[PDB]
Scaffold this active site. Structure first.
Site, PDB file in Angstrom:
ATOM      1  N   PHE A   1      -4.010   3.409   5.945  1.00 28.12           N
ATOM      2  CA  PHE A   1      -3.897   4.783   5.438  1.00 28.12           C
ATOM      3  C   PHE A   1      -3.893   4.923   3.901  1.00 28.12           C
ATOM      4  CE2 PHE A   1      -2.080   4.859   9.752  1.00 28.12           C
ATOM      5  CZ  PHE A   1      -2.836   5.857  10.329  1.00 28.12           C
ATOM      6  N   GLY A   2      -3.615   3.840   3.185  1.00 28.85           N
ATOM      7  CA  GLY A   2      -3.558   3.873   1.723  1.00 28.85           C
ATOM      8  C   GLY A   2      -4.527   2.954   1.013  1.00 28.85           C
TER       9      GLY A   2
ATOM     10  N   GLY B   1      -7.952  -2.785  -3.548  1.00 28.53           N
ATOM     11  CA  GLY B   1      -7.694  -3.156  -2.161  1.00 28.53           C
ATOM     12  C   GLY B   1      -7.304  -1.949  -1.337  1.00 28.53           C
ATOM     13  N   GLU B   2      -7.307  -2.093   0.000  1.00 30.36           N
ATOM     14  CA  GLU B   2      -6.908  -0.999   0.886  1.00 30.36           C
ATOM     15  C   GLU B   2      -6.246  -1.458   2.182  1.00 30.36           C
ATOM     16  OE1 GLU B   2     -10.574   0.986   3.042  1.00 30.36           O
ATOM     17  OE2 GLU B   2     -11.184   0.389   1.010  1.00 30.36           O
ATOM     18  N   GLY B   3      -5.387  -0.589   2.710  1.00 34.21           N
ATOM     19  CA  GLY B   3      -4.705  -0.731   3.994  1.00 34.21           C
ATOM     20  C   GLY B   3      -5.310   0.251   4.980  1.00 34.21           C
TER      21      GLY B   3
ATOM     22  N   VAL C   1      -5.507   1.315  -3.320  1.00 35.90           N
ATOM     23  CA  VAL C   1      -5.139   1.102  -4.715  1.00 35.90           C
ATOM     24  C   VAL C   1      -6.441   0.953  -5.529  1.00 35.90           C
ATOM     25  CG1 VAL C   1      -3.955  -0.423  -6.382  1.00 35.90           C
ATOM     26  CG2 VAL C   1      -2.880   0.063  -4.156  1.00 35.90           C
TER      27      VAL C   1
ATOM     28  N   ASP D   1       7.621  -5.290   5.293  1.00 37.22           N
ATOM     29  CA  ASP D   1       6.220  -5.703   5.133  1.00 37.22           C
ATOM     30  C   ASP D   1       6.060  -6.887   4.138  1.00 37.22           C
ATOM     31  OD1 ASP D   1       3.522  -5.178   6.027  1.00 37.22           O
ATOM     32  OD2 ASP D   1       3.125  -3.776   4.387  1.00 37.22           O
TER      33      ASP D   1
HETATM   34  C1  KEP Z   1      -6.671  -7.119  -2.466  1.00 40.40           C
HETATM   35  N1  KEP Z   1      -5.643  -6.275  -3.063  1.00 40.40           N
HETATM   36  C2  KEP Z   1      -5.307  -6.191  -4.356  1.00 40.40           C
HETATM   37  C3  KEP Z   1      -4.340  -5.229  -4.459  1.00 40.40           C
HETATM   38  N2  KEP Z   1      -3.684  -4.718  -5.612  1.00 40.40           N
HETATM   39  C4  KEP Z   1      -3.918  -5.074  -6.919  1.00 40.40           C
HETATM   40  O1  KEP Z   1      -4.828  -5.826  -7.272  1.00 40.40           O
HETATM   41  C5  KEP Z   1      -2.989  -4.491  -7.923  1.00 40.40           C
HETATM   42  C6  KEP Z   1      -2.974  -4.774  -9.300  1.00 40.40           C
HETATM   43  N3  KEP Z   1      -1.998  -4.151  -9.941  1.00 40.40           N
HETATM   44  N4  KEP Z   1      -1.342  -3.442  -8.967  1.00 40.40           N
HETATM   45  C7  KEP Z   1      -0.186  -2.711  -9.129  1.00 40.40           C
HETATM   46  C8  KEP Z   1       0.350  -2.145  -8.023  1.00 40.40           C
HETATM   47  C9  KEP Z   1      -0.313  -2.320  -6.778  1.00 40.40           C
HETATM   48  N5  KEP Z   1      -1.423  -3.027  -6.609  1.00 40.40           N
HETATM   49  C10 KEP Z   1      -1.925  -3.603  -7.733  1.00 40.40           C
HETATM   50  C11 KEP Z   1      -4.138  -4.781  -3.129  1.00 40.40           C
HETATM   51  C12 KEP Z   1      -3.177  -3.776  -2.616  1.00 40.40           C
HETATM   52  C13 KEP Z   1      -3.652  -2.733  -1.808  1.00 40.40           C
HETATM   53  C14 KEP Z   1      -2.763  -1.827  -1.261  1.00 40.40           C
HETATM   54 CL1  KEP Z   1      -3.361  -0.607  -0.167  1.00 40.40          CL
HETATM   55  C15 KEP Z   1      -1.406  -1.890  -1.525  1.00 40.40           C
HETATM   56  C16 KEP Z   1      -0.923  -2.894  -2.345  1.00 40.40           C
HETATM   57  C17 KEP Z   1      -1.795  -3.839  -2.878  1.00 40.40           C
HETATM   58  O2  KEP Z   1      -1.378  -4.851  -3.718  1.00 40.40           O
HETATM   59  C18 KEP Z   1      -0.434  -5.736  -3.272  1.00 40.40           C
HETATM   60  F1  KEP Z   1      -0.542  -6.955  -3.799  1.00 40.40           F
HETATM   61  F2  KEP Z   1       0.785  -5.313  -3.609  1.00 40.40           F
HETATM   62  N6  KEP Z   1      -4.937  -5.424  -2.273  1.00 40.40           N
END
Ligand code: KEP
Length: 277
Positions: free
Chosen positions: A21-22, A17-19, A24, A128
């Protein structure tokens, strides 16, 4: 150092996923080069460095069962965390209505409150809190998964004053955050109430806090939208109850106009636990 990850062994699998500026990504940290290494979630900045470094230091020192685990860093810097394959509550709830009942939703609610109470005891404000920032460990457990906007409250002070409001989730914000950019722990409690509404509606897009508030204030106000939002809240208007009277009363206590009239996370935990017995 087990918390130091070498760039040359960090292999990208797919974006998560993405925001603004950041982002993952799912990576495998594979020093043996045979695709047997462990899968990790990697947070990086898109091509704000000072803010990510502060964010990394906050997460390195948080240890709670309902907070995503910090694994390390890759030094420009990248944050390395444990990987939760079920992803965010925002994407998980629409696909799993048949698995998740009201009792499980209230257990998720207690878990978010516990992780948030731990954060607040360390003198931090999240800013947030929404379903998109809550990760699913299993059908029995959730964890707060992001700390991108997290700020420390000054000693002998009860709030942090924000300077940059450019990427604010206004439909999850308390009146004091909209009117003066003042963030208290009670401001995090207001955002939890909105997150709880998301959880009860299974994160349905048509019933999202943004969809519902725009129907309440009108969607053609443009630059006046936040002013109209402040006006409707001042009138005492709130998001409607999803299509459970006792759960809605705890939700309405999150939405008391004055931050002092709002409950604490500890008080909410007592409330939800009384309903689960
Ligand atoms: C659609 N989407 C999925 C995301 N993340 C995961 O699937 C994930 C799995 N393990 N993990 C561990 C730490 C952080 N993220 C994950 C994000 C996501 C994108 C950003 Cl820029 C910041 C936080 C995000 O996650 C949110 F839930 F905290 N968007």
């Amino acid at each position: 150092d087990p918390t130091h990850f070498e760039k040359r062994f960090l292999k990208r699998i797919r974006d998560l996923g993405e925001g603004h500026f950041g982002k993952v990504e799912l990576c495998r940290y594979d020093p043996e080069g045979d695709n047997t290494g462990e899968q990790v979630a990697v947070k990086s900045l898109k091509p704000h460095i000072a803010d990510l470094k502060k964010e990394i230091e906050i997460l390195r020192n948080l240890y709670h069962e309902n907070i995503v685990k910090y694994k390390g860093i890759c030094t420009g810097i990248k944050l390395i965390m444990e990987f939760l394959p079920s992803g965010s509550l925002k994407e998980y709830l629409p696909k799993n209505k048949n698995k998740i009942n009201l009792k499980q939703q209230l257990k998720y609610a207690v878990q978010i409150c516990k992780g948030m109470d731990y954060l607040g005891s360390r003198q931090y404000v999240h800013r947030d809190l929404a379903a998109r920032n809550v990760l699913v460990e299993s059908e029995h457990q959730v964890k707060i998964g992001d700390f991108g906007l997290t700020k420390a409250i000054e000693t002998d002070k009860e709030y942090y004053t924000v300077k940059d409001d450019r990427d604010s989730p206004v439909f999850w914000y308390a009146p004091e955050c909209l009117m003066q950019s003042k963030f208290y722990i009670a401001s995090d409690v207001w955002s939890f109430g909105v997150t709880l509404h998301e959880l009860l509606t299974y994160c349905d897009s048509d019933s999202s806090p943004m969809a519902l508030f725009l129907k309440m204030i009108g969607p053609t106000h443009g630059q006046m939208t936040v002013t109209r939002l402040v006006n409707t809240l001042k009138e005492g208007k709130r998001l409607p109850c999803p299509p459970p009277d006792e759960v809605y009363q705890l939700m309405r206590k999150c939405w008391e106009f004055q931050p002092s009239n709002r409950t604490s996370f500890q008080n909410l935990i007592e409330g939800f636990e009384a309903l689960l017995k």
